[PDB]
Amino acid sequence: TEEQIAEFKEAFSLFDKDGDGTITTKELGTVMRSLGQNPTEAELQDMINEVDADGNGTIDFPEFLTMMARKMKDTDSEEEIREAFRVFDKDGNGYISAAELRHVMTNLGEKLTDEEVDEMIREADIDGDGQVNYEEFVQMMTA
């Protein structure tokens, strides 16, 4: 949408610190520190790489708008993320407890906040037993 296009141009200029028309890696680390994070330079590089259509080392507004307009169902990682669900459900029976989900989401990777994992289980637990069926949740998120 045109308002989507405007918000994406706004955010792009936000990352477009120097205003050249692309988002170099330096603005990316800059905006990450502005948000508060210290992303390694190779990290900002791969973000460009998976955003940089041309591969110039900067995220142009073309690449910006294309990412900002694309949805999760526009990403093609169904069975991948399902295997990634399978790991914590070591039994591989389709249901991982909200217990194991919550605990490991508190002490693995970018562990989230309580409400973060809370909404995670609320969307990943839809039947109301804490046991988080994972393939249903990927099916619901990926469509």
């Binding site: 948000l35 791969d46 990634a84 989230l112 809370d118 909404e119």
Partner: protein, 354 residues
């Protein structure tokens, strides 16, 4: 300092707590302290040298109680490292651990006598070294292997018992009168056990060559049988550690999978319509166009983590041939998909030219 306050609490307690780097350095050294304290505690048990023994031993006792009392408190605060415990409730709640309570009990007794306690003093230093564990994973590891080997062990134990009983009884009736040694069945049983374990004190033995011919077989059996369970459990550990090495490659694989799905839901919660999904927005606004920027922030970090989990497993012999399987098989699939495309265009031009 508060940034360093929580930094030092968290990281240095994880050292103090379950470590992976060089925390055993400190832990082995404090072990050495208390242990050598114990040794010199026995050093007081030599009358020729016990005087100087206590002369330096009370030195070491001062050192020991100091070390573990401060360990009590500092582990308390460093346990502010723990998210679930931060302040009044948490650290005034977790203190009720049995390890902790026996800790404070023995330690307050230590400062009490540090304010004729030799025997129980030995006992409390004992409990200190026992305190080294905190987890019983020794007993856990053992019982695992044992139950894993239960029927083997029972086999050895039973048959060894029978050899012991039989051969001992026989020789007891083999040198019943020729030796003051073998004069009661209690005598022989002492001899049987002292022998079949290959200890060989020497204070008993058969002299009637008929009796010697008895032992000179049942030894050949029993001593090996008694030597089995050592050898079994020794291997049992060895096998366990090898196979666990292999699986270790997979847990390395598992953590990148273990985190990518995090960014996955981090993507799903990023819908502006999903204001109900206030999890990440409040995570960012607490870590605080720009919000759709933050959307792209977390969601793009998810995408890069997607390829990250794609590399979650690197190799493993069977899994590695799984991967090379993937190479040839999936290259074939690429080629078959091409042929699919070929048949599809042909199916399209079926009507195109008809």
């Amino acid at each position: 300092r508060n940034a360093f306050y929580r930094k030092l609490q968290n990281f240095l307690y994880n050292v103090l707590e379950r470590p992976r780097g060089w925390a055993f350095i400190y832990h082995a050294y404090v072990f050495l302290l208390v242990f050598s304290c114990l040794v010199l505690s026995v050093f007081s048990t030599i009358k020729e040298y016990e005087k100087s023994s206590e002369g330096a031993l009370y030195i070491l006792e001062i050192v020991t109680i100091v070390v573990f009392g401060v360990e009590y408190f500092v582990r308390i605060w460093a346990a502010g490292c723990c998210c679930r415990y931060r302040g009044w409730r948490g650290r005034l709640k977790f203190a009720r651990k049995p390890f902790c309570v026996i800790d404070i009990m023995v330690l307050i007794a230590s400062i009490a006598v540090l304010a004729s306690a030799l025997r129980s003093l030995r006992f409390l230093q004992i409990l200190r070294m026992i305190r080294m564990d905190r987890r019983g994973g020794t007993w856990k590891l053992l019982g695992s292997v044992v139950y894993a080997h239960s029927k083997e062990l029972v086999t050895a134990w039973y048959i060894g018992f029978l050899c012991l009983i039989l051969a001992s009884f026989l020789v007891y009736l083999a040198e019943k009168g020729e030796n003051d040694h073998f004069d009661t069945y209690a005598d022989a049983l002492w001899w049987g056990l002292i022998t079949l374990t290959t200890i060989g004190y020497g204070d008993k033995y058969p002299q009637t060559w008929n009796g010697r011919l008895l032992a000179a077989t049942f030894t050949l059996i029993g001593v090996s049988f008694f030597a089995l369970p050592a050898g079994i459990l020794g291997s049992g550990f060895a096998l366990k550690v090898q196979e666990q090495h292999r699986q270790k490659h997979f847990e390395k694989r598992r953590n990148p999978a273990a985190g990518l799905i995090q960014s996955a839901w981090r993507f799903y919660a990023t819908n502006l319509s999903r204001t109900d999904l206030h999890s990440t927005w409040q995570y960012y606004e607490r870590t605080v166009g720009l919000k759709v920027s933050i959307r792209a922030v977390c969601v793009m970090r998810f995408l890069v983590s997607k390829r990250k989990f794609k590399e979650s497993l690197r190799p493993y012999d069977v899994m590695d041939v799984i991967e090379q399987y993937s190479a040839g098989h999936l290259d074939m699939l690429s080629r078959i998909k091409s042929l699919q495309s070929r048949v599809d265009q042909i199916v399209g031009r079926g009507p195109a030219i008809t």
